[PDB]
Amino acid sequence: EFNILLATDSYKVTHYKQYPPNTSKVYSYFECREKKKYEETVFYGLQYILNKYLKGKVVTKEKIQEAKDVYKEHFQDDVFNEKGWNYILEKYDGHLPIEIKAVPEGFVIPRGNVLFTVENTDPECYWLTNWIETILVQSWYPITVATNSREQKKILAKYLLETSGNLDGLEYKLHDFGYRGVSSQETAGIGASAHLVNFKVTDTVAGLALIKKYYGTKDPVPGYSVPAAEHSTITAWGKDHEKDAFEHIVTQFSSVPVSVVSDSYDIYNACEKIWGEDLRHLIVSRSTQAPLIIRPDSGNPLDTVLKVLEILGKKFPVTENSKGYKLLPPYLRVIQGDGVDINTLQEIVEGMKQKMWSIENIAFGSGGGLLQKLTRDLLNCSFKCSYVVTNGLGINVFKDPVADPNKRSKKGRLSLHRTPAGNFVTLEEGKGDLEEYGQDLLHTVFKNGKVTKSYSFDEIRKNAQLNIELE
Amino acid sequence: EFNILLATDSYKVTHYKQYPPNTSKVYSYFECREKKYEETVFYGLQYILNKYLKGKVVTKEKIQEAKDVYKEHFQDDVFNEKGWNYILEKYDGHLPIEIKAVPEGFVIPRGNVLFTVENTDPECYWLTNWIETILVQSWYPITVATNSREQKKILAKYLLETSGNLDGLEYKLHDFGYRGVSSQETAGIGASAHLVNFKVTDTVAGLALIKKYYGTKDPVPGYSVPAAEHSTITAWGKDHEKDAFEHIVTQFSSVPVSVVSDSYDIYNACEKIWGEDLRHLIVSRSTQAPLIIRPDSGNPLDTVLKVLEILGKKFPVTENSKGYKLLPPYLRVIQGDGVDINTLQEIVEGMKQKMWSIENIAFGSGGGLLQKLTRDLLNCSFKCSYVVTNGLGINVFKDPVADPNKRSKKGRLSLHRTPAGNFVTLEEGKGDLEEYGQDLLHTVFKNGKVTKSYSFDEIRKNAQLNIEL
């Protein structure tokens, strides 16, 4: 079972001995710090953490003793605030005396703004605010996946609108293939859920149960997939029988969309000769609702996509849409699912546009690039103490390292507001109390062991919409 | 609760319909495919076998749950209810799968078979690749362990060169990655993989994982020491940095203590606060209880060099037997910002050039150690190499025209020692010719049971550097 007393960075066990004596309040905040592009971030994932790890009775006698035993050996010393944890157990039935205020999930906020704040609600527990830094800071991950996925959606939307005149199918154009490429089962669920803020296609099944349990949707599920081959289901037929494998697979799945990996031996031959000649009669008969989706999986992503489109354009009847771009017949599409990240996605759609191919023709699959190749440094996700009360006096505190102004932190009590022009501003030093800027956009989401405000996944998706979608 | 029917890539739900009719066996293998990182540490499969694959993993409820989810997820009924029910009814929900693997902690060159998977019941031909997704996540502990061991090789080389021995090597790279990984589960797995090579960590999650799944003779596999963070310094107020420092080192007067010193001005903190105002509190400390000064910003090499130059003018420096400068034993430094395998190399080389011993320094690494890694680093990959269809075995493989590096191995595989004592992987069942002695893989899972396992002490022994041996 999970033990909150063992879910912090080891050194934090020692901090209750290090704060100024007579400190009754420690107040801290999280931001995606501005860096002298990712100019705005999607706030998402805190609700998972609050419910799974922070709410209710999280302290017991047994958990205190377990932590005491471990820390004794881990430090080779007895440092451990047993009294402080016993107080929470006895006075609050093991519920954390902490208040967290947060911007609503799904909100899209420019860099350098307060996204949530944390403070103790009982003077005895001044040390607890930063105990839970480690677990709260892991919100960097769903924030960053959601943000990077949304930035890819912006690229897709721009190029889809330009080459086709509309955004039809946009939510189905970036498919999460990252289950095997992330570092754990838990990561898989969190990351997949964050991608579903922006799109509706995933093979990372773990995301669905997370959303159902912690957020919820009106629809039965938040994300969908379609039948698809992998190299094993092609290669198992033997080298000389790739055509037999293809025929078997498209016939088994004759009335739904089906994706077929086509580069086991020679992607160009498969497209031109197997699909384009031997099995053409099985492709041109398919429904618009059940296309064959050809899947290259190797070679230079841009070069390969363009050559695949060139081959198919010569074997199948291509039309020219009203924007002047070429379009494959509706029973035939392509998905590029190798080597896709935000940079290569951009290169591919631009290369397609230059060669006059509509983005209607293609979808992308991304795995490691979508869910694993991301770090806390990307958006400078960071949690810092900005205000303490010592001897009954509040003081505004901060760091400001001489050699790195980008690491300077905010001072005092913070609040988030709309500006007169409709943008966002973070007010420092308790200046939100002057009430010159309308209502604080942070809301209490957790107080004294209870989750006090929750969002559905539908609301989160609404908050995270692109401007181009709004228009 | 975890449900293995919902722990696969969605498309694999449809694969049982795509293999050749009358296929009775699908045999697959994992490697770190060949193209830096010429050898890999095999670590972490035992966690996966125990946490997710062993025992009764199928129930009627789990089957019904999966059926209901996939019906909506595919907008169609494609789920193999009958196949999963067969496992439930015939094997009381235990997986009819056999997995063979190299011993954990083994250090093996790229492009070798590391583990193999096959079904033990013909009805369950589809099961081998169902579990690809979950087994392939072994890339992560393998890659963490490998990259951590590569950093240890660098530290060993330079510590040996500048000090003449390896004392303290296992205390030289401290895991600071708890907040910088993607989840609680990842934190435990990754921290455990780092502890294959080192003994210092703040990622507490790793301790319980090791205790539960591997075990050590010692009470714990890893250690930490008291240390400040910016909040415990800045909370005192900007004009009271000295007071914070004095309080902290007095509270921790007889154990090592690390104190972040760059809240406002690292160079002032070192030269004036530590080097003058509080000097009397530092020079009085035990060798067993040094102050460890922690810079945390600026160019990592430039800041380390300048911090050392400052301290060398304020404290009595000696010259060790190798001719390198050494701070007094009550004073050390830890660089815990911007450290990854590349910058670690740059810092120790730069110290060596300025005649500073690597004894003086330790490193902390977080995102660089546990998060900034992907499955592409070592090309960790699971592929089918052998099937039986209509009673006939066939050697199968992919070999994409545009990327020879993605070619996979053919047929039944085995791992062997060569005459020169190296590793070779034999394909096409050739291990059976018995020209290369015994298969070095061991059966580790069979029919719902873990059949071979390793303690964390044995894994550490397997993972030792040549220089340590």
Author numbering:
A (entry chain A): 8 to 43, 53 to 487
B (entry chain B): 8 to 42, 53 to 486
Sentences copied from the publication:
The crystal structures of G217 mutants revealed that they also perturbed inhibitor binding through a His191-mediated mechanism. Glycine is required for this position to allow a water molecule to bind and participate in the D219-H191-WAT-Y188 network. The addition of a Cβ atom in G217A occludes the water molecule and disrupts the hydrogen bond network. In addition, A217 pushes the H191 imidazole ring away from its normal orientation by 30°, rendering this part of the tunnel less compatible with GNE-618 binding. The conformational changes induced by G217A are amplified in the G217V mutant, where the H191 side chain is twisted 40° away from the optimal herringbone conformation. Similar to H191R, inhibitors with narrow and flexible linkers, including APO866, are less sensitive to the relatively subtle changes induced by the G217A and G217V mutations, which is also consistent with the modest drop in the biochemical potency of compounds 9-11. The RD line harboring the G217V mutation also had the D93 deletion. The D93del/G217V RD line is 500 to 4000 fold resistant suggesting that a significant increase in resistance is conferred by the G217V mutation.
